[PDB]
Design a protein around this ligand. Sequence first.
Ligand SMILES: c1cc(N2CCC(N3CCCC3)CC2)ccc1CCN1CCCC1
Ligand SMILES: c1cc(N2CCC(N3CCCC3)CC2)ccc1CCN1CCCC1
Lengths: 307, 307
Amino acid sequence: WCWASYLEEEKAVAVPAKLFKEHQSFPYNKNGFKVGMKLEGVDPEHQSVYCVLTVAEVCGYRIKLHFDGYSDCYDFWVNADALDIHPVGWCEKTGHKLHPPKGYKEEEFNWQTYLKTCKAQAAPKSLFEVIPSGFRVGMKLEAVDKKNPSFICVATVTDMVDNRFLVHFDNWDESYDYWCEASSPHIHPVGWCKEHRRTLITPPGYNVKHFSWDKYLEETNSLPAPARAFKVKPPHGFQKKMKLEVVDKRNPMFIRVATVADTDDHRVKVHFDGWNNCYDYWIDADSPDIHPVGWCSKTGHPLQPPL
Amino acid sequence: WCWASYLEEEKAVAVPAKLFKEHQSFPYNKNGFKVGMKLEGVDPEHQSVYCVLTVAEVCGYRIKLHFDGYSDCYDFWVNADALDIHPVGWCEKTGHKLHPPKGYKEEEFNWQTYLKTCKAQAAPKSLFEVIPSGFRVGMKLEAVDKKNPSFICVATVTDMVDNRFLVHFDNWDESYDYWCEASSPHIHPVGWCKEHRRTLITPPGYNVKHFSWDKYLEETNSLPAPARAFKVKPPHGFQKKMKLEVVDKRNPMFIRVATVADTDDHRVKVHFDGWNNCYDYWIDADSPDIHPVGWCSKTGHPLQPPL
Ligand SMILES: c1cc(N2CCC(N3CCCC3)CC2)ccc1CCN1CCCC1
Ligand SMILES: c1cc(N2CCC(N3CCCC3)CC2)ccc1CCN1CCCC1
């Protein structure tokens, strides 16, 4: 099976590699991770929480991570250059809380003892990975609940690591938190909802009858994020019918031959060639899980042909 | 394509219809629901919340429900006899709160006005569907977080409809709530964790250093559920290699030819014939989404053959 041939047969073009951001395109590195190495990492379903993780599988430029002491059902795939993994010791060095393995309490855990207990090694620092901005921990803003994207709500930046920061919805469960960057289309400076005739969702258990950002910021002794820090996402250039390689959301070990079925400002609707259209789904055009044609061959990862 | 033949070729037996509970087996009714009818129903991701719903699709004995005013991305399939759908007016008749469509406030909503606005009809009462027990709203108990099943926690029965009741985790987000029955393997009478040397998770922001059910029940002026009400789930008889019809979790419009790959006391691991084993997954053996061979043919629903 060959992309060049397939592209000729289908009279179609590949999405140009140059439209993909660096985290999506060909890596300029081999995958050094080995099964059994241990590291720290963000829980994708509880994104404020850093956890103890073990590399459970290696495939091309991707690794499958396991939360020590928890069920394999929670195992997740990231790319070898993911931003939300960190070497052993990072939490302590950076002042962050590390959630211990299932069955330990914090006071029973540290890395030196745990590595001896497991007869295991930390993933070397050398395997892991700037542009300044006006976002600081503590600042408040208006953000889309990614799980319920019609709702825009009062949020706070609660953590920050280099160019990414963490959005939390004041008085809402942690599980709604997510990491993003200054250009995210999901975040808005205070009083953006006013200026656009949109409903701002206010914190549970609050003066909802006439809520005020000014009063709230004083009552919480907090600054707003400055409008100048909110940078603008330039549109992606992806076009319908262009082909690419996509991680199958529904079984993420596989990467599949895919087609751009539809677009909007910041997303593409992917379609797995050979499969029914009812499998198609939306994904951010900057996702690390979509790739230029040839990414699998270049990285050593198997590619699923059309069904 | 024919089950009888396939079963001969594969030298396999169907799971006996008689091992399936009434909500899984052949219905003794046609599907009267029509596209466009409106009703009330529980939100599967927010199970304490009753919502305004419209029938968006009809297929065999199943219906696909749409949350008025919200994205189609939230559409969900139930069986025509589901317990958690209700006719127009039920919430008001039963004293429950009805969440209005996206874009209405409660005070702007009632059914008579809304049906005139939409030029639409309620699903007749005749389309909708006893065994006494000692569970009452307000009672407390110990329950498994179904999303994090290693954790057993302080919970409260917060709602009750005939034989089902709703479990809520005290001081935790509503999204963790779920409906169940008196025989659920996920619920336990107070001090079951003591009697089994298990850690009870206590409510956020509580005397965790030496938590007491007795003190807590007085401080909340609440009764415990009596041990006598906790009935016992008899094991299912499903055996490996037996065949059945299963709703595809990952694309629930489809029902597929399936095989029991593994079992435990209350679950079966289903496998879609023709597909890679990495698609297999666990499901409660009493789920309304698994069915006896021939269920699709009897009900008018298409059946996906093996890949
Ligand atoms: C249930 C839950 C919610 N919310 C969940 C919480 C949500 N966010 C939590 C983080 C900021 C706001 C705010 C809205 C809104 C409406 C419902 C009931 C209607 N269903 C929700 C999706 C399908 C319809
Ligand atoms: C994150 C969240 C939680 N919880 C989420 C809340 C949960 N339940 C809420 C309803 C009752 C208890 C209690 C445990 C536990 C551990 C973590 C971090 C570790 N990851 C969780 C699943 C994979 C590892």
